[PDB]
Scaffold this active site. Structure first.
Site, PDB file in Angstrom:
ATOM      1  N   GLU A  30       0.818  -1.212   0.000  1.00 20.02           N
ATOM      2  CA  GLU A  30       0.000   0.000   0.000  1.00 20.02           C
ATOM      3  C   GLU A  30       0.856   1.268   0.000  1.00 20.02           C
ATOM      4  OE1 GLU A  30      -2.123  -1.209   3.632  1.00 20.02           O
ATOM      5  OE2 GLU A  30      -3.955  -1.263   2.390  1.00 20.02           O
TER       6      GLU A  30
ATOM      7  N   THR B 219      -0.878   2.942  -7.996  1.00 19.29           N
ATOM      8  CA  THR B 219      -1.451   4.264  -8.202  1.00 19.29           C
ATOM      9  C   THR B 219      -0.599   5.070  -9.199  1.00 19.29           C
ATOM     10  OG1 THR B 219      -2.232   4.265  -5.905  1.00 19.29           O
ATOM     11  CG2 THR B 219      -2.273   6.345  -7.096  1.00 19.29           C
TER      12      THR B 219
ATOM     13  N   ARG C 257      -8.642   0.900  -4.489  1.00 15.04           N
ATOM     14  CA  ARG C 257      -7.543   0.104  -3.937  1.00 15.04           C
ATOM     15  C   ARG C 257      -7.783  -1.391  -4.097  1.00 15.04           C
ATOM     16  NH1 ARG C 257      -5.916  -4.077  -0.214  1.00 15.04           N
ATOM     17  NH2 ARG C 257      -3.694  -3.625   0.242  1.00 15.04           N
TER      18      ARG C 257
ATOM     19  N   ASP D 147       4.838  -3.458 -12.191  1.00 10.98           N
ATOM     20  CA  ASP D 147       4.131  -3.414 -10.919  1.00 10.98           C
ATOM     21  C   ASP D 147       4.181  -4.798 -10.268  1.00 10.98           C
ATOM     22  OD1 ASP D 147       1.986  -3.429  -8.896  1.00 10.98           O
ATOM     23  OD2 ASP D 147       1.408  -1.508  -9.788  1.00 10.98           O
TER      24      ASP D 147
ATOM     25  N   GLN E 256       3.773  -6.688  -0.873  1.00  8.06           N
ATOM     26  CA  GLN E 256       3.497  -7.451   0.343  1.00  8.06           C
ATOM     27  C   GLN E 256       4.569  -8.543   0.527  1.00  8.06           C
ATOM     28  OE1 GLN E 256      -0.675  -7.287   1.281  1.00  8.06           O
ATOM     29  NE2 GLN E 256      -0.711  -9.509   1.697  1.00  8.06           N
TER      30      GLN E 256
HETATM   31  N1  LIG Z   1      -4.316  10.050   0.330  1.00  5.73           N
HETATM   32  C1  LIG Z   1      -3.468   9.445  -0.486  1.00  5.73           C
HETATM   33  N2  LIG Z   1      -3.784   8.181  -0.890  1.00  5.73           N
HETATM   34  C2  LIG Z   1      -2.837   7.636  -1.739  1.00  5.73           C
HETATM   35  C3  LIG Z   1      -1.672   8.217  -2.182  1.00  5.73           C
HETATM   36  N3  LIG Z   1      -1.000   7.348  -3.019  1.00  5.73           N
HETATM   37  C4  LIG Z   1      -1.741   6.310  -3.042  1.00  5.73           C
HETATM   38  N4  LIG Z   1      -2.874   6.388  -2.306  1.00  5.73           N
HETATM   39  C5  LIG Z   1      -3.983   5.414  -2.066  1.00  5.73           C
HETATM   40  O1  LIG Z   1      -3.389   4.344  -1.281  1.00  5.73           O
HETATM   41  C6  LIG Z   1      -3.995   3.026  -1.528  1.00  5.73           C
HETATM   42  C7  LIG Z   1      -2.901   2.010  -1.758  1.00  5.73           C
HETATM   43  O2  LIG Z   1      -2.270   2.336  -3.022  1.00  5.73           O
HETATM   44  P1  LIG Z   1      -1.649   1.191  -4.012  1.00  5.73           P
HETATM   45  O3  LIG Z   1      -1.102   1.920  -5.217  1.00  5.73           O
HETATM   46  O4  LIG Z   1      -2.704   0.108  -4.104  1.00  5.73           O
HETATM   47  O5  LIG Z   1      -0.453   0.617  -3.171  1.00  5.73           O
HETATM   48  P2  LIG Z   1       0.535  -0.555  -3.684  1.00  5.73           P
HETATM   49  O6  LIG Z   1       1.906  -0.261  -3.389  1.00  5.73           O
HETATM   50  O7  LIG Z   1       0.278  -0.709  -5.133  1.00  5.73           O
HETATM   51  O8  LIG Z   1       0.301  -1.853  -2.665  1.00  5.73           O
HETATM   52  P3  LIG Z   1       0.190  -3.429  -3.159  1.00  5.73           P
HETATM   53  O9  LIG Z   1      -0.756  -3.304  -4.012  1.00  5.73           O
HETATM   54  O10 LIG Z   1       1.530  -3.975  -3.571  1.00  5.73           O
HETATM   55  S1  LIG Z   1      -0.074  -4.366  -1.527  1.00  5.73           S
HETATM   56  C8  LIG Z   1      -4.877   3.278  -2.781  1.00  5.73           C
HETATM   57  O11 LIG Z   1      -6.241   3.270  -2.293  1.00  5.73           O
HETATM   58  C9  LIG Z   1      -4.513   4.697  -3.323  1.00  5.73           C
HETATM   59  O12 LIG Z   1      -5.634   5.383  -3.890  1.00  5.73           O
HETATM   60  C10 LIG Z   1      -1.303   9.567  -1.772  1.00  5.73           C
HETATM   61  O13 LIG Z   1      -0.264  10.113  -2.157  1.00  5.73           O
HETATM   62  N5  LIG Z   1      -2.289  10.092  -0.913  1.00  5.73           N
HETATM   63 MN   LIG Z   2      -0.258  -2.537  -6.092  1.00  8.19          MN
END
Ligand SMILES: Nc1nc2c(ncn2[C@@H]2O[C@H](COP(=O)(O)OP(=O)(O)OP(O)(O)=S)[C@@H](O)[C@H]2O)c(=O)[nH]1
Ligand SMILES: [Mn+2]
Ligand SMILES: Nc1ncnc2c1ncn2[C@@H]1O[C@H](COP(=O)(O)OP(=O)(O)OP(=O)(O)O)[C@H]2OC3(O[C@H]21)C([N+](=O)[O-])=CC(=[N+]([O-])O)C=C3[N+](=O)[O-]
Ligand SMILES: C=C[C@@]1(C)CC(=O)[C@]2(O)[C@@]3(C)[C@@H](O)CCC(C)(C)[C@@H]3[C@H](O)[C@H](OC(=O)CCCCN3CCN(C)CC3)[C@@]2(C)O1
Ligand SMILES: [Cl-]
Ligand SMILES: [Mn+2]
Ligand SMILES: [Mn+2]
Lengths: 189, 190, 322
Positions: free
Chosen positions: C12, C17, C141, C163, C167
């Site tokens: 996360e 994103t 998400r 990507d 985790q």
């Molecule tokens: N408020 C806010 N939310 C954010 C920001 N960047 C991402 N998010 C939110 O955080 C949540 C997690 O983002 P995501 O891109 O799914 O993480 P990830 O690294 O891809 O995680 P995974 O999927 O390997 S477990 C999403 O709901 C996204 O909209 C930010 O800069 N600000």
């Molecule tokens: Mn992801």
């Protein structure tokens, strides 16, 4: 090809790899996975060029399993047995190192045994060196029926290992086709 | 150069993989001397390495009483499917002469399959030309779930065979838990 | 001229994103479902965490106690049809001051980030004609399990976005991209400095990032690979900073000595306290990249906001000149 009287055969496989292997479009279709195996086998070969292991002779690599015989004297009188065990641990120390940078938790499964073997080469086309005899079979069988992060040795082998300073625990009974049931032990660490 | 070790491995497609194993080797292994076996063993594969060159099959590796060559290497061949079948054909009578002078019930379990593969060598000590691919793993299991004096081919090896051979149901599913788990249709050269 | 970019970072952290942005910049009935799911799996998380917290949070309107039971009864429905009721009950709860009081403590339990976003707009998603806006999809998400290769092009130049699962369990697949990789993109949840990882519910989310970065930076198979550092979620960071109830020095004592850099370039009208913290988190990583790796690779910090297309468009034009 001649026949020896006391050669220590070892098998160190990685049952966790087959699942790791996957022919996806992203990893070049399994090509990337093999790359990691290469860094594993290679890493295990870097031990052969080490003073304390100058006596260990890598025989071959079955899939993702390592096979090395200690006691061919080329290509205590039973001290080469304890050395082989040190090579097993050596591999562990290196497999764990890989995990550190790989993010895996690859565990090694080793089965060591000693006895008479028939070293030599086979195959007309491209002559290759390999050992034969019941000794190797039992060793292998003690690998396919071992436990992650454990060395499985037979009675005679456990005894010698103890005269060398190693403590052993009786795993139980294991069945080796054509030989029936045997009593194996786990070299305590 | 740096980072990783140059992996001497190259991809290949449209190839046939054939595995063979001595049915009940311990059978005679408990009869013949530790040396007599190594002789028969060396004697058998000897003819094999030669037959392979005649059938255009490349020898990969000898594992105890298991022998497997792959067709379509190095130079690609659209006849790969037949090459292996041909191999299994002649391979058999080569293990039959083992009944005349030694242990009986000695037959080969041919397991042929086709698909892409990865040939080359791993590590950096005592290199051993080996192959890597699920297709290879399949040929292996095919051999495992095969029948004495018979050839066990998959559905892929049958298509590459242009149906030039007469086959029959293999039922590899009720033979190997792998040919079952993966829903694989197997046949047997008649 | 085709580059291969690999996005790394803890869970996360904001990886997927960023890829979305790359598709929104240089490049629905199906996603709508997920959006609702995020909303459901959101509200149910807050309520359920009221009785468990210590001290436990109590509702402001005992009436809603019934709506609380409703939400806890359908918390595990296979194919929730999302009836008109849910939305009414949901919003009703979200409006309950008690529920919100529990929201401010969302750091004491695993809770997605799109919580605030979606909840504030239940009346919009409840509609039958609902059409997810770019922001809705950027706020959505969904756990990423595996590796997905995005293929885009900027100014007649090919790229290869990668990507992967951030985790712990998924991290074992990363290796399959370490070879022949142009540059590595390390995403970090700068805002998640008072939260613990989800894998065990006890390992600090920021520390997890640090340790993770250190592993990638000092990796044997990435000696010559330069990693860009996206200190993502600056918006949520500045917020918590201005709040004043979740002191940073109480999670990282070294912050009691830290002093804002003199080379610092604080944004216009940027609170000095935010600046003194946004850089703190950055320097925490720089020390890891300064400890080793010399001449063979470098690190380039970049305060970012994955959900801000206007931000990632900016910071990205820099990742291209590197
Ligand atoms: N408020 C806010 N939310 C954010 C920001 N960047 C991402 N998010 C939110 O955080 C949540 C997690 O983002 P995501 O891109 O799914 O993480 P990830 O690294 O891809 O995680 P995974 O999927 O390997 S477990 C999403 O709901 C996204 O909209 C930010 O800069 N600000
Ligand atoms: Mn992801
Ligand atoms: N994991 C392994 N790694 C390396 N080698 C293995 C391995 N597993 C088994 N072998 C060797 O291969 C032979 C095959 O054994 P096994 O797979 O149980 O039986 P079969 O051949 O009978 O087939 P089946 O199981 O019935 O389908 C054995 O014969 C011999 O050494 C053994 C053997 N023995 O077990 O005592 C004695 C012998 N000579 O010469 O004395 C020659 C063998 N050989 O050539 O293969
Ligand atoms: C590298 C990845 C992966 C998944 C892919 C692959 O093609 C293999 O290398 C083959 C198939 C392949 O190299 C053909 C030879 C052999 C020896 C058959 C390998 C092993 O079965 C590997 O796994 C193992 O080491 C575990 C099983 C070992 C059991 N074998 C069965 C066959 N007999 C003849 C020898 C012992 C393998 C399956 O592992
Ligand atoms: Cl993070
Ligand atoms: Mn056999
Ligand atoms: Mn065999």
């Amino acid at each position: 090809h001649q026949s020896y009287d006391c050669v220590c055969v070892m098998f160190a496989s990685i049952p966790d790899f087959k699942e790791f292997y996957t022919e996806s479009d992203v990893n070049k279709e399994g090509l990337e996975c093999l790359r990691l195996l290469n860094e594993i086998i290679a890493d295990f070969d870097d031990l052969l060029s080490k003073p304390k292991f100058s006596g260990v002779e890598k025989i071959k690599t079955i899939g993702s399993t390592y096979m090395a015989a200690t006691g061919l004297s080329a290509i205590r009188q039973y001290m080469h047995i304890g050395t082989m065990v040190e090579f097993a641990y050596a591999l562990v120390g290196k497999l764990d190192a890989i995990n550190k940078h790989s993010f895996n938790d690859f565990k090694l499964r080793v089965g060591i045994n000693h006895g008479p073997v028939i070293a030599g080469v086979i195959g007309a086309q491209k002559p290759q060196y390999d050992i034969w005899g019941n000794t190797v079979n039992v060793a292998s069988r003690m690998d396919s029926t071992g436990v992650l992060d454990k060395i499985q040795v037979t009675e005679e082998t456990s005894l010698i290992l103890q005269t060398l300073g190693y403590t052993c625990t009786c795993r139980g009974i294991i069945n080796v086709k054509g030989k029936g049931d045997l009593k194996t032990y786990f070299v305590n660490t | 150069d740096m980072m990783f070790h140059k992996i001497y491995i190259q991809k290949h497609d449209n190839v046939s993989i054939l595995f063979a194993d001595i049915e009940g080797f311990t059978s005679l292994a408990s009869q013949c001397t530790a040396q007599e076996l190594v002789m028969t063993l060396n004697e058998l594969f000897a003819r094999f390495d030669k037959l392979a060159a005649e059938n255009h099959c490349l020898r990969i590796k000898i594992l105890g009483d298991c022998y497997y060559c792959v067709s379509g290497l190095p130079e690609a061949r659209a006849d790969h499917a037949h090459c292996c079948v041909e191999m299994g054909m002649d391979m058999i009578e080569a293990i039959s002469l083992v009944r005349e002078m030694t242990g009986v019930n000695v037959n080969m379990r041919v397991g042929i399959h086709s698909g892409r593969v990865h040939c080359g060598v791993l590590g950096l000590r005592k290199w051993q030309f080996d192959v890597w691919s699920n297709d290879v793993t399949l040929a292996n299991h095919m051999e495992a779930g095969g029948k004495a004096g018979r050839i066990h081919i998959t559905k892929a090896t049958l298509s590459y065979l242009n149906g030039d051979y007469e086959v029959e149901p293999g039922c590899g599913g009720e033979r190997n838990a792998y040919l079952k788990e993966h829903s694989i249709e197997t046949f047997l050269i008649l | 001229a085709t580059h291969r970019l690999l996005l790394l970072g803890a869970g996360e952290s904001g990886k997927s994103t960023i890829v979305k942005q790359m598709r929104i910049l240089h490049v629905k009935a199906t996603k709508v479902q997920d959006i609702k799911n995020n909303l459901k799996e959101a509200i149910e998380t807050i309520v359920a965490a009221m009785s468990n917290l210590v001290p436990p949070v109590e509702l402001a309107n005992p009436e809603n106690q019934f709506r609380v039971d409703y939400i806890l009864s359908v918390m595990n429905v296979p194919d929730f049809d999302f009836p008109p009721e849910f939305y009414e009950h949901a919003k009703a709860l979200w409006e309950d001051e008690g529920v919100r009081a529990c929201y401010e403590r969302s750091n004491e339990y695993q809770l997605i980030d799109c919580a605030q976003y979606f909840l504030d707009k239940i009346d919009v998603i409840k509609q039958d004609d609902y059409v997810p806006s770019d922001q809705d999809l950027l706020r959505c998400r969904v756990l990423t399990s595996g590796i997905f290769e995005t293929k885009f092009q900027v100014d007649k130049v090919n790229f290869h976005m990668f990507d992967v699962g951030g985790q712990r369990d998924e991290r074992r697949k990363w290796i399959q991209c370490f070879n022949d990789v142009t540059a590595i993109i390390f995403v970090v949840a700068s805002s998640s400095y008072n939260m613990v990882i989800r894998e065990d519910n006890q390992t600090n989310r920021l520390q997890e990032a640090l340790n993770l970065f250190k592993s990638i930076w000092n990796n044997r198979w990435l000696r010559t690979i330069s990693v860009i550092l996206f200190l993502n979620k600056q918006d949520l960071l500045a917020e918590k900073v201005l709040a004043g109830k979740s002191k940073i020095e109480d999670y990282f004592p070294e912050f009691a000595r830290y002093t804002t850099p003199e080379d610092a370039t604080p944004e216009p009208g940027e609170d000095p306290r935010v600046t003194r913290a946004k850089y703190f988190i950055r320097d925490e990583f720089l020390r890891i990249s300064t400890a080793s790796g010399d001449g063979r690779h470098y690190c380039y910090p970049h305060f970012t906001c994955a959900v801000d297309t206007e931000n990632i468009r900016r910071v990205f034009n820099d990742c291209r000149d590197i």
